[PDB]
Design a protein around this nucleic acid. Sequence first.
RNA 1: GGCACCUGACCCCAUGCCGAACUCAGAAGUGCCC
RNA 2: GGCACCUGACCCCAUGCCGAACUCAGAAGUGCCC
Lengths: 180, 179
Amino acid sequence: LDVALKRKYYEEVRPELIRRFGYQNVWEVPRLEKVVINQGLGEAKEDARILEKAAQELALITGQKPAVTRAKKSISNFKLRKGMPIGLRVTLRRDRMWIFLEKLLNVALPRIRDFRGLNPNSFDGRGNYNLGLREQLIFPEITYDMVDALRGMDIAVVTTAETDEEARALLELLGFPFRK
Amino acid sequence: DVALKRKYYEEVRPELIRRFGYQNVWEVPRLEKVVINQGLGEAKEDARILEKAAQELALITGQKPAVTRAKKSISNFKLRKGMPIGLRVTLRRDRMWIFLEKLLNVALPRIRDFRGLNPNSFDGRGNYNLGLREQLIFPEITYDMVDALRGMDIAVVTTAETDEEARALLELLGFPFRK
RNA sequence: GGCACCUGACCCCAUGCCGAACUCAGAAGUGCCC
RNA sequence: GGCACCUGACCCCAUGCCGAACUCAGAAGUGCCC
Ligand SMILES: [K+]
Ligand SMILES: [K+]
Ligand SMILES: [Mg+2]
Ligand SMILES: [Mg+2]
Ligand SMILES: [Mg+2]
Ligand SMILES: [Mg+2]
């Protein structure tokens, strides 16, 4: 399972984190835990062929089956208000996560005109990074293009770091193209 | 009574931060769960003493024990695939606190000649294990139902990354370590 | 409003045991998107 | 041999997605019961 971004973590990223913060044992060094990708529908468009087009492209770029999230309790009862399926969700762990981040950061994000870098301030206060991408994402597989149809998918990079400063060191050194 | 929790949140967390210098209160080690594993005594090869034993541990811990059995993978001589080898309960949150309080404010004191706890029983990742062989230390275990169960292997799992931090946690909580 | 984090379980629902997980909850907690 | 930790997985089994959980696996890994 020779993955490019994984290889970089143990080879480069891990040894330098143990320097910046000097961790006692190798198991306290922050790691990547999961990547949750959420492509919402926002009820702005209801066509059924939307959920299925998104469900299938999201599955190719992630290599995993998306789960259909749904509206729990009801809302405004006029007639045309709450559907049922409200978006797609996939949780990437292990190898599929290393492969998705390598394609996202190194081939998809760069092949975008309107891109200067990621906002280094989008950290949740507990070591996790939150991103929102409403552009076209070009992947080796297919092209994720629901720019006009749906809004932006919500990516959450959840790590084992305890603080944001250690979360971005991991991410900075990992490859994430920020602006700081 | 959840008095051991108050102690953690009022005394221990601040004393640990002082000792190790945690910048954030959520990095301070805490108890995640306690797993109890009871071997079988007379409840073994039976289904009436095994019910009085389960309800036995069920009252000691506050929750429904789980029955551990021998993996199902028979060869060619079909004679079943493993019967019950014991009971298991995973204590988290309040039930975990209440059990740790009883354990040291009731169960450990009822032991005669008690030395202390081995300060070495740390698994290397910040967790602690101990075995309470002979009972009569738990008020609940009724008479005429004592040898229904053997001794319990306890595993105190914490969020502490090392034994050092884990030990400080336990010692500040009030575990009577031999040392 | 949604996903992630955080925290809980009154409610649907859930645990070979465990609201750990799954489910649910949360204007006046944190991040991001609309 | 059991539980916990750790690491791993189409072998039974499993995930609204996810070997995260559940299941299973690991003499020559750590801890307590042996
Ligand atoms: K929770
Ligand atoms: K595991
Ligand atoms: Mg984190
Ligand atoms: Mg630990
Ligand atoms: Mg459920
Ligand atoms: Mg299963």
